[PDB]
């Protein structure tokens, strides 16, 4: 029994031999890009809005929330942390070594940094799914629909837009007309089974794991690193604090991931 290590040299020793590296990322890695984690939007946190019940009973409020985040995000750029992860992958790929990013984030900032082996387990801010036809589609339009123009203001006290359901984003496929929702996995919903099998495949065979800027309170993502760790495979935690999963782990590196990751992945 002992506190987790704070030794960068010890971690780097493993990093040089690792052939299969898994990087699990949460909101923290993008909060360093000026990305608002949720952390309040008006009077609510993300867990109260990222729910099919919220959407069923006030879809306009939910769409305002997601509209705000889409518009804010578009003009955000990848940071040193995202970059270090991307460049690490690219460099190791030429050595025949695999680096894979499993992200709880829906901001696609890993995609913008150039990450190739990316598992977006909660979907994307910039994808829609039709609640009628089920079709999934990319959508970076600003604003996603006319009625949301100038809406989504985040200040407590801001009045609900109360957009009629017909004027929320609607499907344009084969004249469907169905109500669109964010293609994001919400609390109470299942992650994509196909994505989960791929996640399991990487976890079951990696020889090094990094869990990066995640609170590890969202399930089942929170169980990913401990699973790797329970194989005895070393796990390194990069955060501005400790987590409920921390003491399972080998290392804890305190501080911004923009500082600690470029060093660790050099």
């Amino acid at each position: 029994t002992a506190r987790p290590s704070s030794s960068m040299a010890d971690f780097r020793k493993f990093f040089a031999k690792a052939k299969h590296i898994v990087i699990i990322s949460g909101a923290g890695v993008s909060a360093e890009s000026g990305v608002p984690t949720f952390g309040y939007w008006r009077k609510w946190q993300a867990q109260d809005l990222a729910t099919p019940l919220a959407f069923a009973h006030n879809p306009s409020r939910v769409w305002e929330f997601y509209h705000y985040r889409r518009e804010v995000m578009g003009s955000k750029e990848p940071n040193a942390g995202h970059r270090a992860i991307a460049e690490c992958e690219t460099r190791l790929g030429k050595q025949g070594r695999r680096v894979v990013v499993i992200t709880q984030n829906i901001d696609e900032l890993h995609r913008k940094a150039g990450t190739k082996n990316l598992l977006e387990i909660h979907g994307s801010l910039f994808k829609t799914r039709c609640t009628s036809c089920g079709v999934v589609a990319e959508n970076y339009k600003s604003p996603i629909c006319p009625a949301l123009s100038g809406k989504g203001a985040p200040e407590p006290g801001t009045q609900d837009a109360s957009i009629p359901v017909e004027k929320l984003p609607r499907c344009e496929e084969a004249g469907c007309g169905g109500l669109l929702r964010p293609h994001v996995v919400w609390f109470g919903e299942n992650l994509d089974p196909a994505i989960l099998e791929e996640v399991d495949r990487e976890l079951a065979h990696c020889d090094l794991c990094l869990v990066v800027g995640t609170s590890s309170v969202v399930y089942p993502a929170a169980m990913f690193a401990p699973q790797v760790a329970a194989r005895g495979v070393p796990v390194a935690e990069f955060n501005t604090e400790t987590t409920p999963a921390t003491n399972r782990f080998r290392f804890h590196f305190q501080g911004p991931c923009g500082t600690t990751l470029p060093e660790a992945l050099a």
């Binding site: 909660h122 919400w186 609390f187 109470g188 299942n190 992650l191 989960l196 399930y219 089942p220």
Partner: peptide, 7 residues
């Protein structure tokens, strides 16, 4: 286990 939860 596939269920997204806070708990």
């Amino acid at each position: 286990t596939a269920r997204k939860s806070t708990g």
